[PDB]
């Protein structure tokens, strides 16, 4: 098999900028590869075929280039309806292999993250397992860090995230950490921290309650 | 005028079969190629199988991951392409697109790109029963603005629906994508900001609604000391 | 824009649609003009004035024999 | 193709009828007099006909004036003659250009009409603005749709025709038909029998009417828009259409050619490429990057350009258009598998799908009518021996009357 | 004669796809950066295309440089004008050669490109050693075989791409083939048929086969070395050569055309004539010294150059060519008179020597069929009349049964 390699997995832009994904492949496909565009929950749409030709319908400001092992998919100026996912794949025998994909995310001004913290509910504790939630309310950029700190231990294993879209009126995102315990071990200690880490916050913010109030 | 409508999908058992059938209209379904492609919640896109036209054989082509597990096929009396998919595993829950593979010329043994997609059907392989959800307050024990919301737990299968306030509360709302649990089971959080000085006036309840199971419930966020 | 083509295997042949017409229907003519001048000691210069003077004698004269034969088809 | 079923016709007899009119006496003051105020002007004839009138050199005004009083004389300064020369040099060229094309000379070059004169007598041409408009744009295609046709050099002024265009017809639906030959595929030589489809052309809808051009050479096509020339058409009606959907179509009888020439050959059309693969030949179709990505079967075959670079037929190469639009591969039975290729004709160059029919009807006639009259020389009877008694017929012998 | 059997191709798809990669963005910026420094370059563009560079013309550097600073102004030297005309002189006689020619022009015109780039061209072409010099020696015949097309004039510069050919087949050996009408030689009018070989035109190894060219007047020669297009060429087997020596050779089924139009004619050879003198037509041939060398009989024959110089058929004066050769005359009886004018089909376009033996096979059939079996049948017996009686031959008539 033939294996393909997109970069970056991730791109911040802006609405008129220029922008460049690279495909690279670990053999040369003789110019047999093929450019998708997905927009959420949509299916693909096949932009460039072979190299560089266009399929039709796709505006003039898509671009296909590169040869052999490097090849370039790039916007000479974006839209707002060009942000959405894009998937290389290579044609030169089976399996026709995909790409990793390079989300296109839209570039704004920092801002740190709102942070609030759950304790479990008593109607969940009377059932025998215990849901410590940490929010992380309109941030950018997506990268951000989080900690759970019972009494001072770090956590692992136990922490399950989940984020948002990109907010479509402030194109914001918003963090759910999730730690899950049994009844027993979170009536063992006393003291539940969120640490968060993130570019707008200067030093980790740690939000954190005593068992009981 | 062209369509590809791929049907079949839903729930299934780990280690059984499932046929999806891709039916084909507004072209000539014996002359092109067909290939399914799917991708995972969450994960990219995995190219799955490929069969070639009458004219070249009728030869499948299959990935590793599938290959011996998964069976394409034709019927070109009815403009239909089937994919069966044998002794299924949990990572094969995912959206089945079938796509139509264009020739480099007119018609031809070389392929360029997938002209068509069609718009994809769901396929969940989980071994849990149907479960409704169970809907736990997240209160705010802390004094600008507050924020508070629901957790909906424990659940099967996707999806559910939550609305704060009967549809009245829409601003500030954030419902965050289902995780799957170590048990099998769906979970998610659907939060809301507000501001601190109409907590004592206002009150939120979030309604979450799970056809699947017929379960409407709806909890009352307060705060507590 | 938005051309298409279609081959008939049957008759072995093509069609390419979606042109546009620009048919040459009919004629107009114009006439041009050029004014002439009716024209009937060496230093630097006169010499090569008076050759190109003579490079137009002999245009004007050349276009008089060739006017001669009135155009015929 | 079908060029010879065209008209003859005289291009530039019009030019030619103004020139005439332009001989007569004080014809060519009028217009003198009408150009001494400004360089351009429109004026009628004394037959009435209205034409516009251009006064694009003027070297009476430079040779009197500016060139006149210097001529004992001497020249003060050297840039009079640089500026003399540019002033003279249009007139030598035109000169040139008159002298080798006998007077009248096609496409119209820039020293005969500039771009900045061209596009004036087209903003004050009697047409519309959308005319004016088209003709502006594509002064390279009406330089190479006119004349110029020399006319008179009478009281100190020079007279020449230019032959303009009239696009009467503009923004009508076109399209262009490609053919090839369509054998049969059998391994014996000279056994193949060939059915070639011979409407190939232009198409224009055009007053009810379709305006078809057998030599798509002289048509020229820029964008998508086709400036062709009436002159080389025929006028058929909208029917002929029918011919590409269904060529046994009742309501017209599309036009064939037959022959046994099982030649290999390719037509590279706009969106693609038609091959016909015949004998040992190899054809096939090839993608700059990967390489050949088709070898063609024998028979008549079609490639589109999306993703094709070259065709290569035999020892011949070409290159596709790569012009952007697709193309739909209609099925289909080809038609010379439904002749018997006994009582095919093979030679019809003029011919015609119901012409070759009726051809075929009278051979059929011609065999299984008057050739079976072989069946009548073994099964009729010879005369019985010219003996004394009676003869009755026994087996396949006159054996008399002992049977009896 | 065959040219029909040819197929349609696009001439300069290559360089009209090589100018649409061109108008994309970014392009001629990487064109523009790569000639910074020399003025040839090679620049591989977006598809991976390899193409060689050149900037024949710097009016930026001497507008800007040159002339700018000059431009109160004032004028001190009156060289530096005349040094901008012929700097300048150059892109007006491309402006016009475009501009007529609708962009596309065909040969490479001098001002195109100079004799000087063009072997720089041909120097730095990636071809064998061989192929530069073929090119470099014949510049005149690469012109006429080379195309340029107008591309774009984006962003300060004006580019047009320059379409030279290429010859993949070098030194393989060729030959022309000549034909003339062979006719009886009767006395009446109407009685005479005629034949004629269609497979004139040139003929040249290649790659196992054999590419012929009907239209010989679009090869060009110079020397014993043919430069011909296999655009309008045909694939055809070596054994399309046997036609020459064997016509009714079982391998090959060669063209001819039939007719009944006896015409007096003649065809230069490149060493001698041939003459077909029918009818009360005089031809001769004749030496521009001795005079009247020949008078030809009624019938095809040939003439070798070797001290021959003109040749006449009734009121056509022919010269032969003076190219130094040896001319060799095969005797042989002329097929035309191996056919019996009864069944010799006369109305043929795109025949083939087994295609007339085959309707006169045909011919033969009915023939046979009627005349023999008609004769042999015409004396057989009638029947009596049908009385319920039955009748017995005797003597040559029908008795009735006499028994008892
Ligand atoms: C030939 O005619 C066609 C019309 O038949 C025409 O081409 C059209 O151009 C328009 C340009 O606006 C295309 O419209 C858009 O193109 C963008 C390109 O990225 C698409 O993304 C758009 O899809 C949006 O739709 C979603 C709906 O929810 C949006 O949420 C999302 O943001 C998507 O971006 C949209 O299609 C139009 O598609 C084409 N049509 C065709 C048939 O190509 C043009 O006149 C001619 N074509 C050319 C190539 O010149
Ligand atoms: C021609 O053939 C058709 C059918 O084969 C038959 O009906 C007809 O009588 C024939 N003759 C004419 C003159 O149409």
Not at chain 1, 119 to 127: C, G, I, R, T
């Given at each position: ?136 309310n ?26 948002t879209?990109?907010d479509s009126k402030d194109?914001?995102?918003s ?39 | ?134 809907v736990?307050p997240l209160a705010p024990?802390?004094?600008?603005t507050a924020a508070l919301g629901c957790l909906v ?7 559910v629906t939550v609305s704060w306030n009967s549809g009245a509360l829409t601003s500030g709302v954030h419902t965050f ?11 998610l959080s659907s939060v809301v900001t507000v501001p601190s000085s109409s907590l004592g006036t206002q009150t939120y309840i979030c309604n979450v609604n ?6 409407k419930v709806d909890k009352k966020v307060e705060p507590?000391? | ?73 | ?404």
């Amino acid at each position: 098999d033939i294996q393909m390699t997109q970069s970056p997995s991730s791109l911040s832009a802006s609405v008129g900028d220029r922008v460049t994904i690279t495909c690279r492949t670990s053999q040369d496909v003789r110019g047999a590869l093929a450019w998708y565009q997905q927009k959420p929950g949509k299916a693909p749409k096949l932009l460039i075929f072979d190299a560089s030709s266009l399929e039709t319908g796709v505006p003039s400001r898509f671009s296909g280039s590169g040869s052999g092992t490097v090849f370039t998919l790039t916007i000479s100026s974006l839209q707002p309806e060009d942000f959405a996912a894009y998937y290389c794949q290579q044609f030169l025998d089976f399996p026709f292999t995909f790409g990793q994909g390079t989300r296109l995310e839209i570039k704004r001004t920092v801002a740190a993250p709102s942070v609030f913290i759950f304790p479990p509910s008593d109607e969940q504790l009377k059932s025998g397992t215990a849901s410590v939630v940490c929010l992380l309310n309109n941030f950018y950029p997506r990268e951000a860090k989080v900690q759970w700190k019972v009494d001072n231990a770090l956590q692992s294993g136990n922490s399950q995230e989940s984020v948002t879209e990109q907010d479509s009126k402030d194109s914001t995102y918003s963090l759910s950490s999730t730690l899950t315990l049994s009844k027993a071990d979170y009536e063992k200690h006393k003291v539940y921290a969120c640490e968060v880490t993130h570019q707008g916050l200067s030093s980790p913010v740690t939000k954190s309650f005593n068992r009981g109030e | 005028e062209v369509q590809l409508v791929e049907s079949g999908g839903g729930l299934v058992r780990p280690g059984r079969s499932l046929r999806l059938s891709c039916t084909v209209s507004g072209f000539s379904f014996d002359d092109s190629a067909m290939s399914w492609v799917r991708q995972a919640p969450g994960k990219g896109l995995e190219w799955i199988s490929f069969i070639k036209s009458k004219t070249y054989g009728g030869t499948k082509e299959y990935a590793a991951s599938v290959k011996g597990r998964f069976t394409i096929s034709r019927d070109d009396s009815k403009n239909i392409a089937y994919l069966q998919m044998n002794s299924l595993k949990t990572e094969d829950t995912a959206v089945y697109y079938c796509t139509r593979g264009a020739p480099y010329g007119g018609n031809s043994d070389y392929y360029y790109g997938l002209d068509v997609w069609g718009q994809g059907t769901t396929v969940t392989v989980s071994s849990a029963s149907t479960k409704g959800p169970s809907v736990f307050p997240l209160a705010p024990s802390s004094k600008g603005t507050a924020a508070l919301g629901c957790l909906v737990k424990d659940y099967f299968p996707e999806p559910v629906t939550v609305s704060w306030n009967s549809g009245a509360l829409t601003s500030g709302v954030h419902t965050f994508p289902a995780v799957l649990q170590s048990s099998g089971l769906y979970s998610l959080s659907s939060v809301v900001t507000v501001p601190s000085s109409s907590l004592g006036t206002q009150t939120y309840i979030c309604n979450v609604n799970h056809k699947p199971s017929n379960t409407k419930v709806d909890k009352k966020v307060e705060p507590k000391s | 824009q938005n051309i298409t083509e279609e081959f008939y295997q049957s008759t072995c042949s093509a069609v390419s649609k979606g042109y546009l017409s620009a048919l040459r229907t009919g004629w107009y003519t114009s006439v041009i003009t050029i004014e002439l001048s009716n024209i009937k000691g060496t230093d630097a210069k006169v010499k090569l004035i008076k050759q190109e003077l003579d490079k137009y004698k002999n245009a004007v004269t050349e276009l008089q024999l060739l006017m001669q034969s009135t155009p015929a088809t | 193709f079908l060029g010879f079923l065209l008209g003859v016709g005289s291009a530039i007899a019009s030019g030619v009828a103004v020139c005439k009119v332009l001989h007569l006496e004080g014809e060519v003051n009028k217009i003198k007099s009408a150009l001494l105020s400004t360089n351009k002007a429109v004026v009628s004839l004394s037959n009435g006909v209205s034409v516009l009138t251009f006064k694009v050199l003027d070297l009476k005004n430079y040779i009197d004036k500016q060139l006149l009083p210097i001529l004992s004389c001497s020249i003060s300064n050297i840039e009079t003659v640089i500026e003399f020369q540019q002033k003279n040099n249009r007139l030598l060229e035109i000169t040139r250009e008159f002298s080798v094309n006998a007077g009248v000379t096609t496409p119209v070059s820039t020293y005969m009409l500039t771009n900045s004169e061209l596009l004036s007598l087209i903003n004050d041409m009697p047409i519309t603005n959308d005319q004016k408009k088209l003709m502006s744009n594509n002064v390279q295609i009406v330089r190479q749709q006119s004349y110029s046709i020399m006319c008179i050099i009478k009281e100190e002024v020079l007279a020449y025709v230019v032959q303009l265009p009239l696009y009467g017809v503009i923004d009508t639906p076109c399209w262009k038909l490609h053919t090839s030959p369509l054998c049969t595929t059998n391994t014996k030589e000279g056994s193949n029998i060939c059915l070639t489809r011979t409407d190939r052309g232009w198409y224009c809808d055009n007053a009810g009417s379709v305006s078809f051009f057998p030599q798509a050479e002289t048509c020229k096509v820029q964008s998508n828009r086709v400036f062709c020339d009436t002159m080389n058409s025929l006028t058929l009606p909208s029917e002929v259409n029918l011919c590409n959907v269904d060529i046994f179509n009742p309501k017209y009888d599309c036009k064939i050619m037959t022959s046994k020439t099982d030649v290999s050959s390719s037509v590279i059309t706009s969106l693609g490429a038609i091959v016909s693969c015949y004998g040992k030949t190899k054809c096939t179709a090839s993608n700059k990057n990967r390489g050949i990505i088709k070898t063609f079967s024998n028979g008549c075959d079609y490639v589109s350009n999306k993703g094709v670079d070259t065709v290569s037929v035999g020892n011949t190469l070409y290159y596709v258009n790569k012009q952007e639009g697709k193309s739909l591969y209609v099925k289909g039975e080809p038609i010379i598998n439904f002749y018997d290729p006994l009582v095919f004709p093979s030679d019809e160059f003029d011919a015609s799908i119901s012409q070759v029919n009726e051809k075929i009807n009278q051979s059929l006639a011609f065999i299984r009518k008057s050739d079976e009259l072989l069946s009548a020389i073994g099964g009729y009877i010879p005369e019985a021996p010219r003996d004394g008694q009676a003869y009755v017929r026994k087996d396949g012998e006159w054996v008399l009357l002992s049977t009896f």
